[PDB]
Structures are given as C-alpha cells and as structure tokens.
GROMACS .gro file of C-alpha atoms in nm:
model
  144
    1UNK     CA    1   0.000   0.000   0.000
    2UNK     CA    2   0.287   0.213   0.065
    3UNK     CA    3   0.656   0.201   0.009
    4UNK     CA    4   1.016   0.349   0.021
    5UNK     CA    5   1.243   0.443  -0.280
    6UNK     CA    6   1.630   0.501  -0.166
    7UNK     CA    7   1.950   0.592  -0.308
    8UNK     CA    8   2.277   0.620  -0.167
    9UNK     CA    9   2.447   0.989  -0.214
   10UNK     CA   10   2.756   0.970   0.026
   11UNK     CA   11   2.926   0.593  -0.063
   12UNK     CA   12   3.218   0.681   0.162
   13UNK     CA   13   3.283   0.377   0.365
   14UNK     CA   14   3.398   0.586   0.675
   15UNK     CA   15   3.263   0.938   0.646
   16UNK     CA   16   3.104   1.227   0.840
   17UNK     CA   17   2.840   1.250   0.681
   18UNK     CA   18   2.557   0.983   0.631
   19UNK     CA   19   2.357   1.101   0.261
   20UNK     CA   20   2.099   0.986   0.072
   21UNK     CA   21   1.713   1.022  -0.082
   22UNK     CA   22   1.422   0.903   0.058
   23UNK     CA   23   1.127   0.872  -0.157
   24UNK     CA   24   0.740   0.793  -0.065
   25UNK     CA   25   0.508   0.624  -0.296
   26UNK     CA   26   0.130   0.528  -0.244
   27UNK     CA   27   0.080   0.224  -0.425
   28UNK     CA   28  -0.308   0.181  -0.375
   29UNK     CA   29  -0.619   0.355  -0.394
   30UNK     CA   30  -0.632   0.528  -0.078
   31UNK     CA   31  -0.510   0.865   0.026
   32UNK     CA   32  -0.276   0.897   0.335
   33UNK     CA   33  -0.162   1.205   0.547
   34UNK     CA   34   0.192   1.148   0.613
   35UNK     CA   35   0.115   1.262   0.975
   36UNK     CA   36   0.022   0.892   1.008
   37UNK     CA   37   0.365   0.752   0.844
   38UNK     CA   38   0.668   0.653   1.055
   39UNK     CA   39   0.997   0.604   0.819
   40UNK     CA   40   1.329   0.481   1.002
   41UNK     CA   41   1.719   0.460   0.868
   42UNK     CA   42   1.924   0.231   1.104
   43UNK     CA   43   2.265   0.225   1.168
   44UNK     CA   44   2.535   0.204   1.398
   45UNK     CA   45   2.664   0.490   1.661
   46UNK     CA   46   3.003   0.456   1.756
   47UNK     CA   47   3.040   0.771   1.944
   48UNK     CA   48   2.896   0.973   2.221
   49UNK     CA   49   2.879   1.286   2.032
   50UNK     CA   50   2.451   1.387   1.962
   51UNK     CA   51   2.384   1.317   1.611
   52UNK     CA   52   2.247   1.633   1.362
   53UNK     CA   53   1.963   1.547   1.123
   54UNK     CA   54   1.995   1.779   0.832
   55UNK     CA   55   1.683   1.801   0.501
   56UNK     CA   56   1.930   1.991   0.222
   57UNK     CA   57   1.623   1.989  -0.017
   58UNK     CA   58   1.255   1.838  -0.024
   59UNK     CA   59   0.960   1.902  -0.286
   60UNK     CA   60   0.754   1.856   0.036
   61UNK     CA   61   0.915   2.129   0.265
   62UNK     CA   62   1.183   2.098   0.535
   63UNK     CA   63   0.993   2.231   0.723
   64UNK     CA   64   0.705   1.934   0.731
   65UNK     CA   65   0.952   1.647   0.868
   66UNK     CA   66   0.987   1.591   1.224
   67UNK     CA   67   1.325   1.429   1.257
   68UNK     CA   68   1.479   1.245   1.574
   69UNK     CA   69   1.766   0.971   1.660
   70UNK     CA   70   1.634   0.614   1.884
   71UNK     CA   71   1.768   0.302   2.001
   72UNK     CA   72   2.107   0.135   2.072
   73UNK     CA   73   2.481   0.238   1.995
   74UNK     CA   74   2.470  -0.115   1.828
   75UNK     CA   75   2.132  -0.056   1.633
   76UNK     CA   76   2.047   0.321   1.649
   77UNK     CA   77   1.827   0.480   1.381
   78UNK     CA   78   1.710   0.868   1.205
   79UNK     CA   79   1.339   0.861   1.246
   80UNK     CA   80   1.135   1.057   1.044
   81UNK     CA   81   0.810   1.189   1.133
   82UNK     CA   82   0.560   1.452   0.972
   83UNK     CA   83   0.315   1.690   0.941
   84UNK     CA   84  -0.021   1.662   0.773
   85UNK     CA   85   0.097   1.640   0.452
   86UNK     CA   86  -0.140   1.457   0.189
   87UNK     CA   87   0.009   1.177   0.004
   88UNK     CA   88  -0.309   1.105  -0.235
   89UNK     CA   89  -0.347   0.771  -0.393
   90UNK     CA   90  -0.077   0.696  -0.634
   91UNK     CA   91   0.132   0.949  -0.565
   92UNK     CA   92   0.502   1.014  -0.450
   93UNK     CA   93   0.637   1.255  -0.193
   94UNK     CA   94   0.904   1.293  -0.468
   95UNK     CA   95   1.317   1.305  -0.297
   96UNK     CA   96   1.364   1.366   0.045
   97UNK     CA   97   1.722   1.470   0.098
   98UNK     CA   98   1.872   1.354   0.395
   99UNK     CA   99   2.179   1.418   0.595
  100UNK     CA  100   2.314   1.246   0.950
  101UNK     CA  101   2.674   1.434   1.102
  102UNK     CA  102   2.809   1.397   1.437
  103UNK     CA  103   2.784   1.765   1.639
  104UNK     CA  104   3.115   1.733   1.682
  105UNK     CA  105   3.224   1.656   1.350
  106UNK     CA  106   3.379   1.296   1.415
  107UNK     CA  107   3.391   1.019   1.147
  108UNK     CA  108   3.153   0.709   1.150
  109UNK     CA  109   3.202   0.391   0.977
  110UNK     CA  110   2.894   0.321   0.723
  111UNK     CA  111   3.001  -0.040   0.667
  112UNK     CA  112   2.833  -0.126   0.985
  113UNK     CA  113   2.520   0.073   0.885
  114UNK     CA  114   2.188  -0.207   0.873
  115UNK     CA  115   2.022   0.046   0.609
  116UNK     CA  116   2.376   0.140   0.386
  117UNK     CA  117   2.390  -0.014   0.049
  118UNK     CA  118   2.606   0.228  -0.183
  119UNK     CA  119   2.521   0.015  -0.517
  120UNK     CA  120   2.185   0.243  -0.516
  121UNK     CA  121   2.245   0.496  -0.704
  122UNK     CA  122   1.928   0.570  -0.846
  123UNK     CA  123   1.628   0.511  -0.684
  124UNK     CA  124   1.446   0.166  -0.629
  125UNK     CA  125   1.233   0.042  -0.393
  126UNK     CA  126   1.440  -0.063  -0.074
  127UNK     CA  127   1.329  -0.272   0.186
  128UNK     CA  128   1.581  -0.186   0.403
  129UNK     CA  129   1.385   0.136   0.538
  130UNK     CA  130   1.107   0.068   0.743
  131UNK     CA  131   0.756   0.251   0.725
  132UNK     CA  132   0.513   0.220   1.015
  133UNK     CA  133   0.166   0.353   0.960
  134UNK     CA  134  -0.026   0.383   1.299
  135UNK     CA  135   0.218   0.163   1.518
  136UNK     CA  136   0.220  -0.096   1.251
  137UNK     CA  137   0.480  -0.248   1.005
  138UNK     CA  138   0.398  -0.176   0.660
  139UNK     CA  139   0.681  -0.201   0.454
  140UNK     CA  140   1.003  -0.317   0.486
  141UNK     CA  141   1.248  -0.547   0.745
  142UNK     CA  142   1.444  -0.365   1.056
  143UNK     CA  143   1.753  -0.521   1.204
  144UNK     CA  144   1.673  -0.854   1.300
   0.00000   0.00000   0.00000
C-alpha cells in the first residue's frame, strides 16, 4: 500500500556524513496524510557525540519532517516523522534529501550501517527502510 524508494548519495565507507534520498510512494487507492507515516534509517553509533539530522532539499518542505535519533549504539536509527501532509493515492512525496553528522564533527564507519547499500544509485524500492503507519509495520524489514 505504501513504500520506500532510496539511493545512496555519500558511498564513503567511513565518512562524516551519512547522505541519501528518501522517496514515498502510495501504491493503492487510498489517500494517506503522512502525519500517520513513521519512516526509520538504522545504523550504527560509535560515538557519544549527539547526532544532527539535516533536510538539504525536499519538494515537500523541510519544514514538514519531524526528525529524531532512537535506540542502541549497536542498532540506532534517524526517524522521520511529519506533518499533515497529503500523500493522495498513487502518488510520491518525490526526494527527500537527507543528511546524518556527528555535532562534533567525528567520522563514522557506514560499513556497519543495517540500512547502507552504496550500489543504489538511483532510486528503487528498498526494503531496508522501514515505514510504520499507525504503530504498525507496513513495509520493509528492521535489524533482526
């Protein structure tokens, strides 16, 4: 009913930056409000420093996600939440840039990263990402 498109922008193995495109789609004959969608990115937090979410660029508006960081040094993951923005039957959100630094600058090693596969380079439907709707599991596989 719904899914997630992703590519792979920074393919750095070890890097400061985490980078890549999410991208929505409604595959059914519903329309959705995003407000109800849940997507997570998992990977692994080697250091103490507090994580920085950063949107370069979204069709939908930077200003509609509601970003935050969860879970284990081991299995951590960028959450993205959002306003009430329609997603009508059918349609895409369309790229959602997004960008995961250290506050303190300090290097992180992608090649322990669950939701890192640098072959993407164009998007495809990745089931690696996980969208919830409404506390359930609608489309993809976390860690484990």
């Amino acid at each position: 009913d719904v899914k997630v498109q992703y590519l792979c922008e920074n393919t750095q193995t070890s890097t400061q930056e985490i980078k890549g495109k999410f991208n929505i789609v409604n595959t059914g004959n519903r329309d959705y409000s995003l407000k109800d969608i849940v997507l997570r990115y998992y990977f692994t937090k080697e250091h103490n420093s507090q994580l920085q979410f950063i949107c370069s660029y979204t069709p939908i508006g930077s200003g509609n996600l509601i970003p935050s960081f969860g879970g284990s040094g081991d299995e951590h993951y960028l959450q993205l939440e959002f306003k009430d923005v329609k997603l009508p039957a059918g349609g895409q959100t369309g790229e959602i840039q997004f960008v995961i630094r250290y506050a303190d600058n300090s290097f992180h090693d992608q090649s322990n990263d669950y939701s890192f596969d640098p072959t993407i380079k164009a998007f495809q439907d990745y089931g690696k990402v996980t969208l919830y709707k409404n506390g359930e599991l609608v489309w993809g596989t976390p860690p484990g």
